[PDB]
C-alpha cells in the first residue's frame, strides 16, 4: 500500500483495518500469475479486408484483456495494453502467422497493463532474432511508471519487481550515455514514441499501413495520461479503462480525478452508435448501448443538465 512511517505503525486503526479486511492473516493476498491450467487460447475477434483483431479475454487475475491488431497488407502486428500472464502463446502466434511486431501501444501504465511488458519485449525480440519492438505511451504515466515496483509490492508480483521498465530506458527524447571509449541493447532504444496530450482528428494518428489510421485520444480521469485508440474505418474504439460494459473506470486510485473522467466521457459523443467499444476489462459493447443503458453516463449528463459546473463521475469499486 504505502510506506510504513512512525504514525502508521503507532495507529490502532491500521491494525483494525488489517484485521477487518484480511481476517487473522493481516497481510493481503496478492494477485498471482494465472497457471497453465484454466488458461484459454487466443481468439480471432474480427476479420476485415484491412485489419484483423485477435484477442484473449481474462489473461490476468486483474481480469484484463489482451488485443493485437494485424495489418493484412504489411504483415505488421500491434499489441495494445500488453499484459498477459503467458506471452508464449502470442509469440508462437506471431511466428506461425509470419508477422512482425513493431510497436506496443499502452493506454496507461497501471499494473494491470504493464505487468508482463518486459516479458513481451524479451520473448518477441528473441523470436525476432531467429529493429526492435517499440513502445507507444504518454509521458504523464511516468508518475505511474515509478510506482510500478510499489504496485508490484502490494499485489505480490515479486519476480517483476527488480526489472527496469523499457519506458524508463534512454529513448531519442532523452540525453545519451557518455560511455568510456573502449552495448546498445539497453543503452538506447530508437524505436520509442511519446504521445502528446493535444490529440486532434487531423494529425494525431499512427500510420499502421495500407491506409489504416489509428487515432489516439487523450482521455484522463482514470490516469493522468490515458490514450484510447479509435479506428473510424473499422468502427473500433479501444477504450482501455475509460468505458466498460455498463460501468466506467475507477477514480479511487491516486492521480485520478472525477471531473477529468467526466470530460473524458463528454469528449466521446461525436462517434456513431455502431462503433464497437473494446474495453481493457470484461466484455465488449457498443457506444450506442452505453449511451442508452449506462447509468454513469446518465448521471454525468443529468448533472450537466441540472447545472453542475464541476460534474464529477467515477466508480469506487471495479477494475484497476
Amino acid at each position: 500500500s504505502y510506506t510504513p512511517n512512525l504514525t502508521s505503525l503507532t495507529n490502532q486503526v491500521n491494525r483494525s483495518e488489517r484485521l477487518r479486511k484480511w481476517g487473522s492473516a493481516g497481510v493481503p493476498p496478492g494477485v498471482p500469475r494465472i497457471p497453465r491450467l484454466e488458461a484459454k487460447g487466443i481468439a480471432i475477434l474480427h476479420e476485415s479486408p484491412k485489419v484483423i483483431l485477435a484477442g484473449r479475454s481474462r489473461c490476468n487475475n486483474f481480469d484484463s484483456n489482451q488485443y493485437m491488431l494485424i495489418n493484412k497488407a504489411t504483415k505488421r502486428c500491434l499489441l495494445v495494453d500488453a499484459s498477459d500472464d503467458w506471452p508464449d502463446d502470442w509469440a508462437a502466434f506471431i511466428g506461425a502467422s509470419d508477422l512482425t511486431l513493431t510497436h506496443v501501444f499502452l493506454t496507461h501504465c497501471h499494473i494491470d497493463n504493464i505487468i508482463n511488458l518486459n516479458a513481451f519485449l524479451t520473448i518477441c525480440g528473441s523470436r525476432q532474432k531467429q529493429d526492435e519492438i517499440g513502445v507507444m505511451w504518454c509521458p504523464a504515466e511516468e508518475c505511474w511508471v515509478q510506482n510500478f515496483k510499489r504496485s508490484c509490492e502490494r499485489y505480490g508480483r515479486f519476480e517483476e519487481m527488480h526489472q527496469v521498465l523499457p519506458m524508463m530506458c534512454r529513448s531519442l527524447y532523452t540525453p545519451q550515455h557518455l560511455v568510456d571509449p573502449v552495448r546498445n541493447a539497453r543503452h538506447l532504444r530508437r524505436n520509442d514514441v511519446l504521445l502528446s496530450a493535444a490529440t486532434n482528428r487531423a494529425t494525431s494518428f499512427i500510420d499502421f499501413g495500407n491506409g489504416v489510421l489509428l487515432y489516439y485520444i487523450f482521455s484522463p480521469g482514470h490516469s493522468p495520461g490515458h490514450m484510447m485508440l479509435h479506428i473510424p474505418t473499422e468502427r473500433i474504439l479501444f477504450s482501455g479503462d475509460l468505458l466498460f460494459f455498463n460501468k466506467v473506470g475507477r477514480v479511487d486510485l491516486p492521480w485520478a480525478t472525477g471531473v477529468r473522467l467526466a470530460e473524458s466521457l463528454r469528449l466521446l459523443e461525436a462517434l456513431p452508435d455502431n462503433t464497437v467499444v473494446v474495453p481493457g476489462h470484461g466484455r465488449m459493447t457498443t457506444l450506442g448501448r452505453e449511451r442508452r443503458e449506462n447509468k454513469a453516463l446518465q448521471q454525468c449528463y443529468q448533472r450537466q443538465e441540472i447545472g453542475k459546473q464541476e460534474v464529477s463521475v467515477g466508480f469506487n469499486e471495479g477494475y484497476l
Binding site: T7, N11, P28, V251, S312, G314
Partner: protein, 221 residues
C-alpha cells in the same frame, strides 16, 4: 468561552461526488494508550527525547539532602518568576531557566561575577527544581547539552516541598480561532491535493493520519 467556531476550512466529504485523488488520504488516528495523564515530557510527542530525560530525585532524597547536605551535590532552583517564589529551598542556588543556555557558556570567574556563586564542576551532582518540574526539565536538557555527567530533576519541586499550588505557565502555543492557518491561503500545491489535504473524516477535535499513497483492495470484491 461559549464554543467559538473555528476559522479553519476543514470539511467532511459529501454524499454526491465520488472519492478520488488517493495520493493523499485522511483517516482517523487512535493510538494504543492514553498519554494525557502522564508527565509532560513523558508523553507521545517527546518520546525521542526519552534518553534525554534526567533521573528523578524524590521527596525523601530532598529531605535527606535538607538535613544532611553534601559539599558538591548542588541544589539549584530553576524558577524564573520572582513574584511567584515565596520560600527558600535549603542549600539552593538561584539559576533561572531562561538564562541557563547563556549561564553554562561562561567561564568560572564570569559565572561567579554574574551569579554570585561558583560554577559547578562537570562531575558534581546537580539537582534541579521548579514548580511542577517543567522549567527544571528544560534546564536539565540545557545542562545535559553541556557535558554535565550527573544532572537530576525533582519533578514537582516547590509544589510538593512547600505544598504550594503553582505552575510554570507553559503556553503550548495553539492558534487563535481567527488565525487562519497555512494550507487554506496558498497556491503551494495543486487544487486536487489542496482539496484532499483539507478534508477530514469526522470531527476536527481528534487526531488524523495522512496517507501519501493508497492502492485499491482488489481481493475483497
Amino acid at each position: 468561552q461559549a464554543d467559538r467556531r473555528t476559522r479553519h476550512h476543514m470539511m467532511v466529504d459529501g454524499q454526491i461526488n465520488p472519492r478520488e485523488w488517493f495520493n493523499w488520504h485522511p483517516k482517523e488516528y487512535q493510538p494504543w494508550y492514553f498519554d494525557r495523564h502522564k508527565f509532560l515530557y513523558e508523553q507521545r510527542q517527546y518520546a525521542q527525547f526519552h534518553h534525554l530525560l534526567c533521573h528523578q530525585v524524590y521527596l525523601k532524597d530532598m529531605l535527606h539532602l535538607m538535613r544532611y547536605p553534601e559539599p558538591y551535590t548542588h541544589i539549584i532552583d530553576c524558577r524564573t518568576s520572582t513574584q511567584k517564589m515565596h520560600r527558600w529551598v535549603p542549600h539552593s542556588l538561584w539559576l533561572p531557566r531562561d538564562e541557563v543556555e547563556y549561564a553554562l557558556q561562561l567561564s568560572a570567574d564570569e559565572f561567579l561575577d554574574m551569579y554570585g556563586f561558583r560554577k559547578p564542576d562537570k562531575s558534581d551532582d546537580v539537582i534541579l527544581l521548579s514548580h511542577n518540574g517543567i522549567y527544571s526539565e528544560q534546564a536539565g536538557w540545557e545542562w545535559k547539552k553541556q557535558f554535565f555527567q550527573h544532572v537530576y530533576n525533582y519533578r514537582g519541586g516547590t509544589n510538593e516541598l512547600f505544598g504550594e499550588s503553582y505552575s510554570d505557565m507553559n503556553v503550548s502555543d495553539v492558534l487563535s480561532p481567527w488565525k487562519g492557518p497555512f494550507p487554506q491561503s496558498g497556491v503551494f500545491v495543486d487544487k486536487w491535493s489542496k482539496r484532499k489535504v483539507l478534508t477530514r473524516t469526522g470531527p476536527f477535535d481528534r487526531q488524523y493520519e495522512m496517507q501519501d499513497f493508497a492502492l485499491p483492495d482488489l481481493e475483497l470484491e
